[PDB]
């Protein structure tokens, strides 16, 4: 029945419901076996909305398809209705990519959205579940708001719910619910998962040029792997149906509740199927997306790997292949500090501002909201623009296709031309996972003390046929030019006079991340194996940090 009662449910607070920057993520089993775990958190989110503003408010709700998503969406609808939220907009079947949620929030001027995703983390009966809150600019809720949610969640003693309310998520259109002894109805609009996002992309990119690129006998041959995650229907409906790529272009493009039993995390080993496909030489372009669609990996013919640090640089160097940027102009470029310096060479050569930010969304969002940031990238497979306030993997793929269309060259030839023009930033990230915290912290503190010494700048480091001179060494700090905040201890940087860098970052077991960025201006040495070219700087990095001595690790856990 669509005439439902409002009921107050006594509850007991949990103490660990901390939203963080990417949402509250817990094992699916925790949500299911902890009474009112989800309910308490949803209520805590909604309690940050001023009662007076709820009736005219809309929340956008959707997720990445993982197990438990639809049950959580029903819970959100039952609690939102009871709390006097006037409207929910929900993707069909509950499905909305994270970029789609950001798109819709900003399009319909909603107060925010609740995204049911744990991004690249596994899903399924034994996987993870995440609940992410975005606010009215379409982006992640900032710390002041997540702090409030957490504080409310720790002392909550009841929540309001319409236990008999049920939303049909499969069916497009408005469902109205009349609440007992409430004048105004509760309205749920089920929208097509893809339409609003596709329409945005239709305005950003030249779909006529892309159709021509992707169809016919001379078509660019592409393989696009959604990794059984949320981007699946977007690939099928935009790249295949609208832009005319053959249906086999869409790989793993049916969303699955367990992401096919694998991690929806795009890199050369988690997406090893796509890589093996590309190695056959039949296809010109490959890409893979993460579970909720804000990360992307870019491959060329024969499986040529475009480092995410290079990808944002190539997009920057060819940015006016994209109609959006022809119209807005380029307001600025940004990358996270550990990302390679390739983007900087394009910004310097084209005289556009380069913002080097700590890891995290808020720094990019601030700059975008100041009209100072058009294109951003992160070495962790992140690429985006100010078209929305989340990173956007499928957008990054259509950027590449637009560039491929105007350049009329292979992905590899585009990179070779790029390196010949700007030099090459050989780049890798070493992850040392689950190291003992005491050793890793001692490693960081000792290295920081050593770098702080007056004589460390100007020191020279040699290995084989390579001499590196320290130009600067510090613990990265960022004063945000919008909110005034000062972020400290964002990473140990060893900056060398030749344009190369070593960066150390720390992030239930500590993880050391070691980023190596070797700038090579010699045309003869471009397109080499990065691991070979980076070996001198890796040796210098392990020796000055004494990482093996402090952690007992002789090798990183993961190399990217
Ligand atoms: Mg993600």
Curated annotation (Swiss-Prot):
Q: Where is the active site?
A: 119 (phosphoserine intermediate)
Q: Top EC class per UniProt?
A: isomerase
PTM field = Phosphorylation at Thr-469 by PAK1 significantly enhances enzymatic activity.
Q: What is its EC number?
A: 5.4.2.2
Q: Which residues carry this modification: Phosphoserine?
A: 119, 136, 203, 208, 215, 371, 380, 479, 487, 507, 539
| UniProt gene name | PGM1
Q: Quaternary state and partners of this protein?
A: Monomer.
Q: Which GO terms describe its cellular component?
A: cytoplasm; cytosol; extracellular exosome; extracellular region; ficolin-1-rich granule lumen; tertiary granule lumen
Give the recorded effect for residue 223 to C.
In allele PGM1*2+, allele PGM1*2-, allele PGM1*3+ and allele PGM1*3-; phosphoglucomutase activity is similar to wild-type
Q: Where are the transmembrane segments?
A: none
Species of origin: Homo sapiens
- What family is this protein classified in? Belongs to the phosphohexose mutase family.
Q: Which UniProt keywords apply?
A: Acetylation, Carbohydrate metabolism, Congenital disorder of glycosylation, Cytoplasm, Disease variant, Glucose metabolism, Glycogen storage disease, Isomerase, Magnesium, Metal-binding, Phosphoprotein
What is written in the cofactor note of this entry? Binds 1 Mg(2+) ion per subunit.
What is the name of this protein? Phosphoglucomutase-1
What happens upon changing residue 265 to Y? In CDG1T; strongly reduces phosphoglucomutase activity
Q: Which co-factor is required?
A: Mg(2+)
Asked whether the UniProt record includes Hydrolase among its keywords, one would answer: no
Cite the binding residues for alpha-D-glucose 1,6-bisphosphate.
25, 119, 294-295, 359, 378, 380, 391
Sorted alphabetically, which Gene3D superfamilies does this protein's record hold?
Alpha-D-Glucose-1,6-Bisphosphate, subunit A, domain 3, Alpha-D-phosphohexomutase, C-terminal domain
Q: Which residues bind Mg(2+)?
A: 119, 290, 292, 294
Q: Which residues carry this modification: Phosphotyrosine?
A: 355
What outcome is documented for mutating residue 514 to P in this protein? In CDG1T; decreases strongly solubility
Q: Per the UniProt entry, what are the Gene Ontology biological process annotations, in alphabetical order? A: carbohydrate metabolic process; galactose catabolic process via UDP-galactose, Leloir pathway; gluconeogenesis; glucose metabolic process; glycolytic process
N-acetylmethionine occurs at which residues? 3
């Amino acid at each position: 029945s669509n005439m439902v009662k409002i009921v107050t449910v006594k509850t007991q607070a949990y103490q660990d419901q901390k939203p963080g920057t990417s949402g509250l993520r817990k094992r699916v089993k925790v949500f299911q076996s902890s009474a009112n775990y989800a309910e308490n958190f949803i209520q805590s989110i909604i309690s940050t909305v001023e009662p007076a503003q709820r009736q005219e408010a809309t929340l956008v709700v959707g997720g990445d398809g993982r197990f438990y998503m639809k049950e959580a969406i029903q819970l959100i609808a039952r609690i939102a209705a009871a709390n006097g939220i006037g409207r929910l907009v929900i993707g069909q079947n509950g499905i909305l990519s994270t970029p789609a949620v950001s798109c819709i929030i900003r399009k319909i001027k909603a107060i925010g959205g609740i995204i049911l995703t744990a991004s690249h983390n596994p899903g399924g009966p034994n996987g993870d579940f995440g609940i992410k809150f975005n606010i009215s600019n379409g982006g992640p809720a900032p710390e002041a708001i997540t702090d409030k949610i957490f504080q409310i969640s720790k002392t909550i003693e009841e929540y309001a719910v319409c236990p008999d309310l049920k939303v049909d998520l499969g069916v497009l259109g408005k469902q109205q619910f009349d609440l007992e002894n409430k004048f105004k109805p509760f309205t749920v609009e089920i929208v097509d998962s893809v339409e609003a996002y596709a329409t945005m992309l239709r305005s950003i990119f030249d779909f006529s040029a892309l159709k021509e690129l992707l169809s016919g006998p001379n078509r660019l041959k592409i393989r696009i792997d959604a990794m059984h995650g949320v981007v699946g229907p977007y690939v099928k409906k935009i790249l295949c149906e609208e832009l005319g790529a053959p249906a086999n272009s869409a790989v793993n493009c049916v969303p699955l509740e367990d992401f096919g039993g694998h991690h929806p995390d795009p890199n050369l080993t988690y997406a090893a199927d796509l890589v093996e496909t590309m190695k056959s030489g039949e296809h010109d372009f490959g890409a893979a997306f993460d579970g909720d669609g804000d990360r992307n990996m870019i491959l060329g013919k024969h499986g040529f790997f475009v480092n995410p640090s290079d990808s944002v640089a190539v997009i920057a160097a060819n940015i006016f292949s994209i109609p959006y940027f022809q119209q807005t102009g380029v307001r600025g470029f940004a990358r996270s500090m550990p990302t390679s310096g390739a983007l900087d060479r394009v910004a310097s050569a084209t005289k556009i501002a380069l913002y080097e930010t700590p890891t995290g969304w808020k720094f990019f969002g601030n700059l975008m909201d100041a009209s100072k940031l058009s294109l951003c990238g992160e070495e962790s497979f992140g690429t985006g623009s100010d078209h929305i306030r989340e990173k956007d993997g499928l957008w990054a793929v259509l950027a590449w296709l637009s560039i491929l269309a105007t350049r009329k060259q292979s992905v590899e030839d585009i990179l070779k031309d790029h390196w010949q023009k700007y030099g090459q930033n050989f780049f890798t990230r070493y992850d040392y996972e689950e190291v003992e915290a005491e050793g890793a912290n001692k490693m960081m503190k000792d290295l920081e003390a050593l770098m702080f010494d007056r004589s460390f700048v100007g020191k020279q480091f040699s290995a084989n046929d390579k001499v590196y001179t320290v130009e600067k060494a510090d613990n990265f700090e960022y004063s945000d030019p919008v909110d005034g905040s000062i972020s400290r201890n964002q990473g140990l940087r060893l900056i060398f006079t030749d344009g190369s860098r070593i960066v150390f970052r720390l992030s239930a077991g500590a993880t050391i991340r070691l980023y190596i960025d070797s700038y090579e201006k010699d045309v003869a040495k471009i397109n080499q194996d990065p691991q070979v070219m980076l070996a001198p700087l890796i040796s210098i990095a392990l020796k000055v940090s004494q990482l093996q001595e402090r952690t007992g690790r002789t090798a990183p856990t993961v190399i990217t």
